[PDB]
Enzyme design. Structure first.
Site, PDB file in Angstrom:
ATOM      1  N   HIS A  76       0.816  -1.211   0.000  1.00 27.62           N
ATOM      2  CA  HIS A  76       0.000   0.000   0.000  1.00 27.62           C
ATOM      3  C   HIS A  76       0.850   1.263   0.000  1.00 27.62           C
ATOM      4  O   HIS A  76       0.326   2.348  -0.278  1.00 27.62           O
ATOM      5  CB  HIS A  76      -0.984  -0.020   1.167  1.00 27.62           C
ATOM      6  N   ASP A 100      -0.132  -7.611   1.485  1.00 20.59           N
ATOM      7  CA  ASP A 100       0.284  -6.206   1.504  1.00 20.59           C
ATOM      8  C   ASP A 100       1.799  -6.069   1.526  1.00 20.59           C
ATOM      9  O   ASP A 100       2.343  -5.207   2.218  1.00 20.59           O
ATOM     10  CB  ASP A 100      -0.318  -5.442   2.684  1.00 20.59           C
ATOM     11  N   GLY A 156       3.271   6.653   8.703  1.00 20.75           N
ATOM     12  CA  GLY A 156       4.556   6.670   8.038  1.00 20.75           C
ATOM     13  C   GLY A 156       5.530   5.594   8.471  1.00 20.75           C
ATOM     14  O   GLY A 156       6.680   5.604   8.018  1.00 20.75           O
ATOM     15  N   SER A 158       4.658   2.097   8.369  1.00 23.78           N
ATOM     16  CA  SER A 158       4.446   0.822   7.706  1.00 23.78           C
ATOM     17  C   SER A 158       5.729   0.423   6.993  1.00 23.78           C
ATOM     18  O   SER A 158       6.446   1.263   6.444  1.00 23.78           O
ATOM     19  CB  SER A 158       3.289   0.869   6.701  1.00 23.78           C
TER      20      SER A 158
END
Ligand SMILES: COc1ccc2nc(O[C@@H]3C[C@H]4C(=O)N[C@]5(C(=O)NS(=O)(=O)C6(C)CC6)C[C@H]5/C=C\CCCCC[C@H](NC(=O)OC(C)(C)C(F)(F)F)C(=O)N4C3)c(C(F)(F)F)nc2c1
Ligand SMILES: [Zn+2]
Length: 198
Positions: A76, A100, A156, A158
């Site tokens: 993502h 993801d 911020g 991830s």
């Protein structure tokens, strides 16, 4: 029309989380203009160090973590993008939207974390601000913050690591479990799921 179709830029390493000493701190290695330029060319001549990179696209910034020779991050954030390197854009070696998860070959000069085999549930989340946040593992892909905090502090991060007490990689931070804006828990990609993909 076809003549004017644009190409998406590369993910660009713009800094790192320094974990080499007694103090964790964020370092910026590239400013915004140089990031924009490097994103279009995909040519990044900067020297890379460490395990956790701060990365950016034209529109987002997040983290990426080297584990067993692969720089991993969230789909993502990165989508299908290449990553900038000294020789030009590097195509992903792993892409898994269902987890993801994406991965590129680890940049020359990075250092990799070792996948955890401790089976421990006392973890540590590393954020883009070099906060080291205790997290109790609560399932295969979930952990609770010992001290909850607003989602603003996690935004911020991830692609950052959850580590065991001995510094091994246990997982990749994916999403925050938020109630009225407070993160009480986090979801992550377990390192075993990375190890399978490899
Ligand atoms: C087609 O492929 C796709 C396309 C889109 C996808 N968008 C997905 O989620 C998105 C993005 C992700 C996110 O915010 N990531 C973090 C971050 O820092 N991002 S980032 O760096 O800023 C940035 C966005 C990259 C720049 C760590 C967060 C820190 C703060 C949270 C802010 C409030 C958001 C709370 C939310 N919470 C949640 O959905 O929790 C659920 C899952 C319901 C729970 F966990 F509770 F079950 C959450 O965390 N996110 C919503 C997911 C997945 F959900 F898998 F992540 N897969 C996809 C696959
Ligand atoms: Zn371990």
């Amino acid at each position: 029309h076809m003549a004017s179709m644009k190409k998406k830029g590369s993910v660009v390493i713009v800094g790192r989380i320094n974990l080499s000493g007694d103090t964790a701190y964020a370092q910026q290695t590239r400013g915004e203009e140089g990031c924009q330029e490097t994103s279009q060319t995909g040519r990044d001549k900067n020297q890379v160090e460490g395990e956790v990179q701060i990365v950016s696209t034209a529109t987002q910034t997040f983290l990426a973590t080297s584990i067993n020779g692969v720089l991993w991050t969230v789909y993502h954030g990165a989508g299908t993008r290449t990553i900038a390197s000294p020789k030009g854009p590097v195509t992903q070696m792993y892409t898994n939207v269902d987890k993801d998860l994406v991965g590129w070959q680890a940049p020359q000069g990075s250092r990799s974390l070792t996948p955890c085999t401790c089976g421990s549930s006392d973890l540590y989340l590393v954020t883009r601000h070099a906060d080291v946040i205790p997290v109790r593992r609560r399932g295969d892909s979930r952990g609770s913050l010992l001290s909850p905090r607003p989602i603003s502090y996690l935004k911020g991060s991830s692609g950052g690591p959850l580590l065991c007490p001995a510094g091994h990689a246990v997982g990749i931070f994916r999403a925050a479990v938020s109630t009225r804006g407070v993160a009480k828990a986090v979801a992550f990609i377990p390192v075993e799921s990375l190890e399978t993909t490899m």
